[PDB]
Write a protein that binds this DNA or RNA. Structure first.
Ligand SMILES: C=CC[C@@H]1/C=C/C(=O)NC/C=C/C(C)=C/[C@@H](O)C[C@@H](F)Cc2nc(co2)C(=O)N2CCC[C@@H]2C(=O)O[C@@H]1[C@H](C)COC(=O)Nc1cc2ccccc2cn1
Lengths: 209, 142, 56
RNA sequence: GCUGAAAGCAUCUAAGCACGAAACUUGCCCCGAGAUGAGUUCUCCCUGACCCUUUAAGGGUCCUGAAGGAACGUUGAAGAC
RNA sequence: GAUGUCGGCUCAUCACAUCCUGGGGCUGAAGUAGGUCCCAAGGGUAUGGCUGUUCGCCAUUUAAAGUGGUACGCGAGCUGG
RNA sequence: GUGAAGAGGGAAACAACCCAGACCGCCAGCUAAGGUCCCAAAGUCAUGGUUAAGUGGGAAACGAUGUGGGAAGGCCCAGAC
RNA sequence: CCCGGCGAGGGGAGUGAAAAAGAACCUGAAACCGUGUACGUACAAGCAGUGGGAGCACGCUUAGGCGUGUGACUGCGUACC
């Protein structure tokens, strides 16, 4: 089915009566308002565009304001699209709460991973470090060989090298749902999810099942 | 006097439409490339595109002799070392039947900027309907 | 480590295609002194936003 | 393997039909319209007056300067720049 | 009027005459476990003692510790026994 | 015999193979080897056959009711296979 | 006389046949580095030219369809000793 957009509040622990501690990631899932509904006759596919949160009226551009005004709903801090599974039907202005995850039992959480910046092969690709002694000359954490001789005479595409690490879209699948508190707009899922505190998260039910 | 040469600003390019149902792939693409280049015009000029626009319909119904419907392989490389992918004539027809005609014609056209422009005058569709009626394309039984 | 062929004037100019400088889009004007200054900086005389900030 | 002739039989095959593996195509994750074949959808903004002239996708003057963008500044669990 | 060699380290990539896993036929295949041949290259495919060693012997593991090509891959990447 | 000391055309590219020996010029014509569906100049030419393997466009001993043609022979309406 | 740090270095004035003869001084070549104008260039692959060749600009022209510069596209084409 469809998913929801939320914010990562942080992590804590839930104690059960059986003496177990469940690590949970708290996700604030406010009312998700539908801004646009796409069909096949006009767009070529079925989906819905949603928003959540709030934004400074003096900072909302006129194009964005007109997009929300056409739906008759307040503005948010972004826009996200969800596909429909051939049997779902929504309407503009419809508010979707976290109660939609009441009987799912598992979800997939997508977010933007933390940014490590320019990372080395040891950290980015788990390359084995060379000898710290025994004659090593300036080659302790360097990659080593990156190819072969007069044969192909080039470095193959996809070669594992240093470069940007993190700050990319990441999805974690099949996370257990621990609690659904609609009174507080909270969704507790067992385990860690991508991103830092305060980042945006897309929560969809598990597709593997 | 100097031999006549065509001008791309004064050359006349007509529009044609063709039905590919039951037609042999190679024996069809040959006439297309012949017309897309302009060899059928007395004003043919190798450094000018004197060809005509051609619409191809029902590309998903072309014919091939022998067992080429299952033994003909379309290889292509992606750039990575694994790279080498392949698809049969049947697989291509089901996935993207238009590429069968385009690939056959691209190989019969000259290689370079000019031949790359001739290919743009080819409009291939999988069905029997096109959205170029405004150009009034004339039927061509080729 | 070192080149096998001498690069050209062309490639030298291409590399320097990103070496050009950027001029200040505009200079700000003080309310009181009407002097011209960098934005968010004080003037040569010592004014800033018409308040007679440090002059000595 | 089924049915089944050439070959009165037989036969998995020649017509036709059904099963069949971590390989193949998908399904899962990520990039992705410089996909120059440059795509689609929604929304927002601009509704002057003249002159010259080898008179056209022409040039120039005055008025006008939107949406939005950039710049500057405070900065960031973003970042070599 | 210079194409720097063994082995080790780091990083690998392809082939299939396949070591493991997967699918099958025959068996002097009861079962368990094996033998042989066919299909299959998706992924995976030991640590240590001795020796400069590759190899090899030994000890102990593993579903398996595959065979080869890549200047007997890789010193403008390290080492120098 | 050619190259060396020899250009040109053909063999995809290829000093030595095939055709052929460049005094200069021409937006004239006939030919050689080799070729005439498109890339790419010229037959989607004509006539009668073969192949179904993309053989053509890579290869042996050997193996097989693949298929075409030919010369005989054996058993048969006393009823053959 | 003027800008400039009572500078360097320049701009005027003046000398002289000449200051583009001003002492970094007769003549003032080439490599090399620049400003300006015309044309071309951001889907196109390689000794960078050659043959063909559109368009643009400019000069002619007693329109005379010529010349100069540029060179989209295209056939051939792997420097010299
Ligand atoms: C110090 C001192 C060692 C001494 C000389 C050194 C030197 O001159 N360095 C200068 C480097 C020159 C280089 C690297 C030149 C390159 O541009 C081409 C290169 F790689 C190509 C290349 N080189 C090499 C191989 O292929 C080869 O062997 N070497 C290369 C490294 C040294 C070694 C070398 O030559 O060692 C020398 C040793 C005395 C040989 O011992 C032998 O028994 N030799 C031998 C064995 C034979 C058996 C059978 C028949 C006949 C034989 C004849 N000779």
């Amino acid at each position: 089915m469809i998913g929801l957009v939320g914010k990562k509040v942080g992590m804590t622990r839930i104690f059960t009566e059986d003496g177990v501690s469940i690590p949970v990631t708290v996700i604030e899932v406010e009312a998700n308002r539908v801004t646009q509904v796409k069909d096949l006759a006009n767009d070529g596919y079925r989906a819905i565009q949603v928003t959540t949160g709030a934004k400074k009226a003096n900072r909302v551009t006129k194009p964005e304001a007109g997009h929300f005004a056409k739906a008759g709903v307040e503005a948010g801090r972004g826009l996200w699209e969800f596909r429909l599974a051939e049997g779902e039907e929504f309407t503009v202005g419809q508010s979707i709460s976290v109660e939609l995850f009441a009987d799912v039992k598992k979800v997939d959480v997508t977010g933007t991973s933390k940014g490590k910046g320019f990372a080395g092969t040891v950290k980015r690709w788990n390359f084995r470090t060379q000898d710290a002694t025994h004659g090593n000359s300036l080659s302790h954490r360097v990659p080593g060989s990156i190819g072969q001789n007069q044969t192909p005479g080039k470095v193959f595409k996809g070669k594992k090298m240093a470069g940007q690490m993190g700050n990319e879209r990441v999805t974690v699948q099949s996370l257990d749902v621990v609690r659904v508190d609609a009174e507080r707009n909270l969704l507790l899922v067992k385990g860690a999810v991508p991103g830092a505190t305060g980042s945006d998260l897309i929560v969809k039910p598990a597709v593997k099942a | 006097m100097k031999t006549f040469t065509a001008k791309p600003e004064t050359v006349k390019r007509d529009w044609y439409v063709v039905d590919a149902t039951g037609k042999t792939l190679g024996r069809l693409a040959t006439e297309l490339a012949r017309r897309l280049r302009g060899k059928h015009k007395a004003e043919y000029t190798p450094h000018v595109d004197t060809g005509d626009y051609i619409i191809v319909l029902n590309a998903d119904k072309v014919a091939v002799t022998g067992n080429k419907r299952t033994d003909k392989v379309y290889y292509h490389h992606t750039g990575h070392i694994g790279g080498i992918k392949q698809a049969t004539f049947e697989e291509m027809i089901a996935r993207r039947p238009e590429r069968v005609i385009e690939i056959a014609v691209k190989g019969m056209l000259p290689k370079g900027p000019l031949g790359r422009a001739m290919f743009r005058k080819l409009k291939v569709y999988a069905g029997n309907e096109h959205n170029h009626a405004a150009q009034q394309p004339q039927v061509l039984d080729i | 480590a070192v080149q096998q062929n001498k690069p050209t004037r062309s490639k030298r100019g291409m590399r320097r295609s990103h070496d050009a400088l950027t001029a200040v889009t505009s200079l700000s004007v003080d309310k009181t002194s009407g002097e011209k200054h960098l934005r968010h900086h004080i003037t040569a005389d010592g004014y800033y936003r018409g308040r007679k900030v440090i002059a000595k």
